[PDB]
From Swiss-Prot:
Disease affiliated with this protein: Leukemia, acute myelogenous: A subtype of acute leukemia, a cancer of the white blood cells. AML is a malignant disease of bone marrow characterized by maturational arrest of hematopoietic precursors at an early stage of development. Clonal expansion of myeloid blasts occurs in bone marrow, blood, and other tissue. Myelogenous leukemias develop from changes in cells that normally produce neutrophils, basophils, eosinophils and monocytes.
Short sequence motif Effector region: positions: 33-41
Stated name of the protein: GTPase KRas
Species name: Homo sapiens (Human)
Membrane topology note: Lipid-anchor
Residues recorded with modification N6-acetyllysine: 105
Reported effect, residue 62 to R: In a colorectal cancer sample; somatic mutation; promotes interaction with SHOC2 and PP1C
Length: 170
């Protein structure tokens, strides 16, 4: 049998949620992917010897707080909270995404990873120290990624799976 892990990728428009997801799944950088499309993708992977199925929701569209949207998000087992290292506003939004996750999951202990994407770019407006401090304040890992080169991408998604696997053992 394969366990399926339901992962949700969230964060501001333009941070690279779609590029990270497509890079993970298909091993190619899709630049300029339609910002308005929300979809899910699956991949069979081996993580620490466990053959499992990732089901990844790449979020997009309108911010909305209906009971149905909350219930859909509540089915997520772990969340990648993504900002772009050259967009301070996307980093400032992270606290809001974490607050919504904690609210629908009714817990401060939700499997989560803070992802600083676009690390292939030389110009970084978000301080690495500030991002590490924010992740420490939430008790979650911080991983830098590039959806273009694939640097850190497997680590971000596999770390989130490891967190879900551990959470299910509590
Ligand atoms: N909804 C909703 C949610 C539930 N009902 S539950 C639940 C959860 F558990 C986790 C995450 C979310 C979630 C999502 C979801 F993941 F659902 F797609 C999309 C958001 C979204 N999108 C709109 C745009 C930007 C990215 C993409 C999706 N297109 N934007 C914002 O905030 C945007 C800002 C700027 C303007 C005012 N707001 C408050 C802060 F200032 C930040 N939050 C979003 C969000 F929290 C939700
Ligand atoms: N250089 C660089 N550009 C990226 C990276 N990830 C995404 N982009 C670009 O950033 C823009 C937004 O990416 P997208 O995946 O659409 O972001 P989303 O709105 O969060 O889904 C696009 O023009 C991408 O090609 C990355 O790691 N490096
Ligand atoms: Mg997208």
């Amino acid at each position: 049998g394969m366990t399926e892990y339901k992962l949700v990728v969230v964060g501001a428009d333009g941070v690279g949620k779609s590029a990270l997801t497509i890079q993970l799944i298909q091993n190619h950088f899709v630049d300029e992917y339609d910002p308005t499309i929300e979809d899910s993708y699956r991949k069979q992977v081996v993580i620490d010897g466990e053959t499992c199925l990732l089901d990844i929701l790449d979020t997009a569209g309108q911010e909305e707080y209906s009971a149905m949207r909350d219930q859909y998000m509540r089915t997520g087992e772990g969340f990648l909270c993504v900002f772009a290292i050259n967009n301070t506003k996307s980093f400032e939004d992270i606290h809001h995404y974490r607050e919504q996750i904690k609210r629908v999951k009714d817990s401060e202990d939700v499997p989560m990873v803070l992802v600083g994407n676009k690390c292939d770019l030389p110009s970084r407006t978000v301080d690495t120290k500030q991002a590490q401090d924010l992740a420490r304040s939430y008790g979650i890992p911080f991983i830098e990624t590039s959806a273009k080169t694939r640097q850190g991408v497997d680590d971000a998604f596999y770390t989130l799976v490891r967190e879900i696997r551990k959470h299910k053992e509590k």
